[PDB]
Design a protein around this ligand. Structure first.
Ligand SMILES: [Zn+2]
Length: 204
């Protein structure tokens, strides 16, 4: 799946020589990922050796960061990306995606060489995720239903949820157990964080 050249904003984050999290390129100098990936230090391979390698300097965890709540972290790249056909930022949400929308998640298969697979996903409502996770606070989350027969563990951690070539979410938890699509994952709802994201990026 996942046609070649799509997902130019896909980012793999490494600690040491080891894989850690995925992330999105939201600016030529900025990558966004889950705060729970902030063990640190990290470095970012961008684009879909490696097309462009960079490392991070500033790592801004959301101030408001049971599961991780408000887990969002902005990684600053040492040197800016050169925006190509190959590597581009992902447009940030100007709007919130509603339950029922068809979205997409691309993943390399960590949490189970390389290569990206695309799976379509259905926004569920912050209601029937309380069924799978009774006691969850949603409000700032979107639960993404994966279609049956799909292995949830093909996503990564920090990976993007794209809807209509917008970034609506960063994967927080809800991937395990592998082997069943029946449970939805839990993404940070990114259209609720725009005030903060634009402020640390200084992108206004
Ligand atoms: Zn987390």
């Amino acid at each position: 799946p996942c046609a070649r050249g799509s997902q130019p904003w896909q980012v793999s984050l490494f600690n040491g020589l080891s894989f850690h999290c995925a992330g999105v390129l939201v600016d030529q100098s900025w990558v966004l990922t889950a705060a729970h990936c902030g063990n640190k230090p990290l470095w970012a391979r961008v684009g879909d050796q490696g097309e462009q390698l960079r490392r991070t300097t500033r790592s801004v965890v959301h101030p408001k960061y049971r599961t991780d709540e408000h887990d969002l972290m902005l990684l600053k790249l040492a040197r800016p990306v050169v925006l190509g056909p190959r590597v581009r930022a992902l447009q940030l949400p100007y709007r919130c995606a509603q339950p029922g929308d068809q979205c997409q998640v691309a993943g390399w298969g960590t949490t189970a060489n390389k290569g990206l697979t695309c799976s379509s996903i259905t926004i569920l409502s912050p209601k029937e995720c309380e069924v799978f996770y009774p006691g969850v606070v949603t409000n700032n989350m979107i639960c993404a239903g994966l279609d049956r027969g799909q292995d949830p563990c093909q996503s990564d951690s920090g990976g993007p949820l794209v809807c209509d070539e917008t970034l609506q979410g960063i994967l927080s938890w809800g991937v395990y157990p592998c082997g069943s699509a029946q449970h939805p994952a839990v993404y940070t709802q990114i259209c609720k964080y725009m005030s903060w994201i634009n402020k640390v990026i200084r992108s206004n």
